[PDB]
């Protein structure tokens, strides 16, 4: 599914990401925008053999298990295929575990390069939440 910006912001708010572990809501929207262009089905094969899945491009080497990745650790104890759904529930569940590590949102490289240090609340402005 291709979420609109406002649509995604209200869903992520309903899924409890506004102020989760010190991160304001716009961080999550901006991250989804640069990680997957708001596409729940996005996939990206990495040179190391892992794949990045879904709206938050969650990696198969550490977080979910797609059965094809070498040192898979499955930290979110979930099959990768559950992250490729139009329902964001499982993506948000795993993302909350990912950000609870001391690396916080720095695990998402597009967030790191395009969002950190920017006015991230701009991503939720002009939206009915």
């Amino acid at each position, epitope marked *: 599914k291709v979420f609109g910006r406002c649509e995604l912001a209200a869903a992520m708010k*309903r899924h409890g990401l506004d102020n989760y572990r010190g991160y304001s809501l716009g961080n999550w929207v901006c991250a989804a925008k640069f990680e997957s262009n708001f596409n729940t089905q996005a996939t990206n094969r990495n040179t190391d053999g892992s794949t990045d899945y879904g709206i938050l491009q969650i990696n198969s080497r550490w977080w979910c298990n797609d059965g094809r990745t070498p040192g898979s650790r499955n930290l979110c104890n979930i099959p990768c295929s559950a992250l490729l759904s139009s329902d964001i529930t499982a993506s948000v569940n795993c993302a909350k575990k990912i950000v609870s*590590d*001391g690396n916080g949102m720095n695990a998402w490289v597009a967030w790191r390069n395009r969002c950190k240090g920017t006015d991230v609340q701009a991503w939720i402005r002009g939206c009915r939440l």
Partner: antibody, heavy 113, light 107 residues
Framework: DVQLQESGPSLVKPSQTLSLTCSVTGDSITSDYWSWIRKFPGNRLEYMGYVSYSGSTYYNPSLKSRISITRDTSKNQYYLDLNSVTTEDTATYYC???????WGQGTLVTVSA | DIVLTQSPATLSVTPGNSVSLSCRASQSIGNNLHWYQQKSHESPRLLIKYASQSISGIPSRFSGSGSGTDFTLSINSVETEDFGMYFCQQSNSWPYTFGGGTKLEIK
């Protein structure tokens, strides 16, 4: 499947260091985040801290920095050290994964001279 | 810290009746609230995650609802194995905290 088991002393004296070990069976400790929770005598639960996959640690500020959590990847165990205990540290300690699905059985530690 | 207040502190009930436990947060925590059961001489058991996400292996009579600051755990026709303590827990902010507990007791 995964099993967790607490061990260490059940009786300690005031001001010493309490060390507990959590033994994990069924999967590696590198595959999750791991925590320590304790229950006081009147059913009061306190989340103590957790160690995440990168080795970073989060500790409850109610413990004033007397706690250390560490893990041993070759033994498949992780640990709790609590310095300068007092009688207020008398409690049932449990180890558990972060998700909260696996818990150990609990070990009652009493602090007394 | 986020303070979590649970009510009633005690609930006496006859098996086959339905109950609702309440848990209120001092600050808005979204859906970041989990519910545990603790029976005598047993480690806590996770019943509900993220306010209403049901968990595999636990009776369907338990359901949770709520968001923000007000959350409820409901038990449709309580059974004798349900008697014990119920605690809510927020994971929105660090340090994680627990509510004071509801005791569920046979009438």
């Amino acid at each position: 499947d995964v099993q967790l088991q607490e061990s260490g002393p059940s009786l300690v004296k005031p001001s010493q260091t309490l060390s507990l070990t959590c033994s994990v069976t069924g999967d590696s400790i590198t595959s999750d985040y791991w925590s320590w929770i304790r229950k006081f005598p009147g059913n009061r639960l306190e989340y103590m801290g957790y160690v995440s996959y990168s080795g970073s640690t989060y500790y409850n500020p109610s413990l004033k920095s007397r706690i250390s959590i560490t893990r041993d990847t070759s033994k498949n165990q992780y640990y709790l050290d609590l310095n300068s205990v007092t009688t207020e540290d008398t409690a049932t300690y449990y180890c558990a994964n972060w998700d909260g699905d696996y818990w150990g059985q609990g070990t009652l530690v009493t602090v007394s001279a | 810290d986020i303070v979590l207040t649970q009510s009633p502190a005690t609930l006496s009930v006859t098996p086959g009746n339905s109950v609702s436990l309440s848990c209120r947060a001092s600050q808005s925590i979204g859906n970041n609230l989990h519910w545990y059961q603790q029976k005598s001489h047993e480690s806590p058991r996770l019943l509900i995650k993220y306010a209403s996400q049901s968990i595999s292996g636990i009776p369907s009579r338990f359901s949770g609802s709520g968001s923000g600051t007000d959350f409820t755990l409901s038990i449709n026709s309580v059974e004798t194995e349900d008697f014990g303590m119920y605690f809510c827990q927020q994971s929105n902010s660090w340090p994680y905290t627990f509510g004071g507990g509801t005791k569920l007791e046979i009438k």
